[PDB]
């Protein structure tokens, strides 16, 4: 819909249907006027903030409107009229250079899990060091307890979170803060259940298809109006919610063959509207990131597992499914130089040459970390990083990326030394889809807790039980990585021996210490943080035998 006086009009594009009645619950039901590229209008002055509506088909169905701005009642319920307050800064006030993010799942952040929560919750991240927090999808899924990946109305704010008015509030709250929010966005596929859209139009592919269901028609006949209902979203978010930016989910599962690639248009729109754009990409290319001269898409940054990987691989000694690419030190010095380990060589896991250098860019296009939702959930028994790893090792990880040329993206949770395990749960009501994503969860992962249990949404709430030792030193390596200049500078002189290495950058070098050993140190310095009391104030060139633990020296 859209309000231009006192009147509303309502479009509904549906080429399938013949006839549609838009069906206003309380008021009456009216036929509404079919162009031929199949849009239904009407425009009515009888309509109300907080009124709702369904449309009802040519079949006699009824069906909320698929691009709800609000789901009061879930998925199947009926669609209703939100206030359009179109208020937006022309410009973000975050800067790329100086981004940190927090990754925040809005149901298990917070005993509340509502957006309420996590506006309590400001403060503390304010003080941690964080510039801007990353929500996991919002766009109204089934039921309450669900990552955001089953989301299914695209411009609709989870109900159970608080709704519209609850985000809106979000985002003002964190501006007042000086934080940013950006929004997690799913353009590649939609979720099984609370989908209307297959019986209007060729919203989806034939020709291609994503593991979590039907993947967008953004090339076949008939894209035009779907790349529209995507392009939309993205402005639709800017405007009515002056959100700072994006996380894209899964770029990689975008298909699209057209002249000028989705993706690059998603970007432009962001950037028209002086935004952020972070992808998500499993492709290990630079043209997702590259500009457009150079013939990339321009998004701002994207996610690097590589990173991850390297660390997580070599640190806990796991091979499982991606982990068999992965496992030496000389992968995470790689990783640290050359931004992807897979930089277009064969991949085991792959069975095929995967990725592309990266060249000259900058680290500020690239997100690192050492827990996220995806590498704590997928893990059939949700395990933290902090219990396949001592103490030592941990603070090494978190150091490692907090102090890496690229932005740095802080798991919620993980800052405290959080324990309890992060696990799939979704919440369907459809006892096929119930089957379903039981019997594809214990065989893709090997998850053996219910993700249909409440109980295994509990499981994953937050404890906020602090461990202020860890909390600390978080604290102070986001510090330190400001003061020192470490954002973007990909210029680090790297060198290792078996079981350590020490990175060196423009202002500062770090010790990373493995096993006890005995290193030559090429430079001087003062200490900024240390993971022991083992570590001197000051250090000079010199050969020295340290126990496993970090420093940061000046
Ligand atoms: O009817 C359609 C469809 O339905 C069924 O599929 C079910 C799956 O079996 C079930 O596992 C579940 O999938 C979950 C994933 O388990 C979970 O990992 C998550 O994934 C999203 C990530 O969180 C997101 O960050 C992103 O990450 C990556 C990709 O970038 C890339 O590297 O590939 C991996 C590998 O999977 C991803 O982790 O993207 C993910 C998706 O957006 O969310 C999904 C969705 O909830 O869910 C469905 C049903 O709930 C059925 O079995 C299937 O056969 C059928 O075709």
Known sequence: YKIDGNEVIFTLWAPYQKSVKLKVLEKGLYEMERDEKGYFTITLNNVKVRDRYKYVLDDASEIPDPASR????GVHG?????????????????????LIIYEIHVGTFTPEGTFEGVI????????????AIEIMPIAQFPGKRDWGYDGVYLYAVQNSYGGPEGFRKLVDEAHKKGLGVILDVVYNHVGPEGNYMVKLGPYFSQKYKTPWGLTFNFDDAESDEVRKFILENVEYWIKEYNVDGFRLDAVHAIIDTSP???LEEIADVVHKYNRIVIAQSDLNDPRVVNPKEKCGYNIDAQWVDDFHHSIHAYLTGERQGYYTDFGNLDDIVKSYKDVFVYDGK???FRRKTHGEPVGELDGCNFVVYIQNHDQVGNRGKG???IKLVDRESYKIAAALYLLSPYIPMIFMGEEYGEENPFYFFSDFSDSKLIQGVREGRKKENGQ?????????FNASKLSWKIDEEIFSFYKILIKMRKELSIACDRRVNVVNGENWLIIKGREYFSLYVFSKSSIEVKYSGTLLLSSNNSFPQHIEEGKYEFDKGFALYK
Do not use: V
């Open 70 to 73: 609000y789901q009061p009642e």
């Open 78 to 98: 009926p669609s209703q009229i939100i206030q359009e307050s179109k208020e937006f800064n022309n410009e973000t006030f975050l800067k790329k250079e100086d």
């Open 120 to 131: 309590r919750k400001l403060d503390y991240l304010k003080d941690l060091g964080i510039t």
């Open 260 to 262: 000028k690639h989705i």
């Open 346 to 348: 064969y991949s085991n």
């Open 383 to 385: 395990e933290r990083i």
């Open 448 to 456: 053996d807790t219910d993700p249909q249990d409440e109980s295994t």
